Enzyme design. Structure first.
Site, PDB file in Angstrom:
ATOM      1  N   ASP A   1       0.829  -1.199   0.000  1.00 24.29           N
ATOM      2  CA  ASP A   1       0.000   0.000   0.000  1.00 24.29           C
ATOM      3  C   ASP A   1       0.866   1.252   0.000  1.00 24.29           C
ATOM      4  OD1 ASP A   1      -1.910   1.918   0.318  1.00 24.29           O
ATOM      5  OD2 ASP A   1      -2.421   1.418   2.414  1.00 24.29           O
TER       6      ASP A   1
ATOM      7  N   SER B   1      -0.554  15.466 -12.159  1.00 22.81           N
ATOM      8  CA  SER B   1      -0.790  15.076 -13.534  1.00 22.81           C
ATOM      9  C   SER B   1      -1.018  16.320 -14.381  1.00 22.81           C
ATOM     10  CB  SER B   1      -2.002  14.141 -13.614  1.00 22.81           C
ATOM     11  OG  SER B   1      -2.373  13.891 -14.953  1.00 22.81           O
TER      12      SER B   1
END
Length: 330
Positions: free
Chosen positions: A35, A199
């Site tokens: 994770d 992004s």
């Protein structure tokens, strides 16, 4: 040193991925959810409330000759999905795919919440975010990667998650045969303890690319892709009959649909998520309404590039002095 382990979807939907991890002496192998969105290595154990164990493999520290109780240490974690667990702490030897850390904090669960009990395939989590998020008290502990880093050939690990198929976590090296083209690296902020990056935009299907900054986290422990409502609406608008359902808890779509792809930007590079990756199947057994793999982050407070996104790429978690993230197509 290096390590290399195969990671396997837990079910036919890729709801999560499990990777075998050796703990203790002799080895006790548990299947953990790696994770990159949290920083605790915790396991179901001989100390876990019996009614809260339902099929998981447990760590029994009393059977490990290298286990030592970390005196006075406790841990307690609550995840974004509402689940939680807590317990005490041992140090022991932990190996992943041939890479060994001695003295790793192994957080033994005394309590887990219902969603953990109900998932017999996940024996615990192995956190790979930054150690600043680790919940051990009163002395915070380091992640497996943090402990291994100095020994690795290169201070990196990579995530290569499969679509409806096994994949690989590598530590200490970049497998140049595992991706196509080049790896595009992008800046990371560690200020919130996550692999947080920005992004450069998105496209829906064969549509034009929209240049827009989307701050989010690379999170292998989250199944879906959570993005701003504007983006998500633009995606689902291209699917006839798709709608946001308050009762179901997100966008649903007719199971008969063919989904468009979704592209996200990494610098000037582009990662294409095929439409089929965005199908999470019937909302309930036998339903013809299917759950979408792209959902709104509104009310999460952060955008999350979860498995739906990451599995479309070969992803480098670069733990150099200034961390960065790398993405390649594959």
């Amino acid at each position: 040193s290096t390590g290399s382990a195969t990671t396997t979807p837990i079910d036919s939907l890729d709801d999560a991925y499990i990777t075998p991890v050796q703990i203790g002496t002799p080895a006790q192998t548990l299947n953990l959810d790696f994770d990159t969105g949290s920083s605790d290595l915790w396991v179901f154990s001989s100390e876990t409330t019996a009614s809260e164990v339902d099929g998981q493999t447990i760590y029994t520290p009393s059977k490990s000759t290298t286990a030592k109780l970390l005196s006075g240490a406790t841990w307690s974690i609550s995840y974004g999905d509402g689940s939680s667990s807590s317990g005490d702490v041992y140090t022991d030897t932990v190996s992943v795919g041939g890479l060994t850390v001695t003295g790793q904090a192994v957080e033994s669960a005394k309590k887990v919440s219902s969603s953990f009990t109900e998932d017999s395939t996940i024996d615990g989590l192995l956190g790979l975010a930054f150690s600043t998020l680790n919940t051990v008290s009163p002395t915070q502990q380091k992640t497996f990667f943090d402990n291994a880093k100095a020994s690795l050939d290169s201070p990196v690990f990579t995530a290569d998650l499969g679509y409806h198929a096994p994949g690989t976590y590598n530590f200490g090296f970049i497998d140049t045969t595992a991706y196509t083209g080049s790896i595009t690296y992008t800046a990371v902020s560690t200020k919130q303890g996550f692999w947080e990056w920005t992004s450069t935009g998105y496209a829906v299907g064969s549509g034009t690319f929209k240049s827009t900054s989307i701050d989010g986290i690379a999170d292998t422990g989250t199944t879906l892709l959570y993005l701003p409502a504007t983006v998500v609406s633009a995606y689902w608008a291209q699917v006839s009959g798709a709608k946001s359902s308050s009762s179901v808890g997100g966008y649903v779509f007719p199971c008969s649909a063919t989904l468009p792809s979704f592209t996200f930007g990494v610098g000037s590079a582009r990662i294409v998520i095929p439409g089929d990756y965005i199908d999470f199947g019937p909302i309930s057994t036998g339903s013809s309404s299917c759950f979408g793999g792209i959902q709104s982050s509104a009310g999460i407070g952060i955008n999350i590039f979860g498995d739906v996104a990451l599995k479309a790429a070969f992803v480098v978690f670069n733990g150099a002095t200034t961390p960065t993230l790398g993405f390649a197509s594959k």
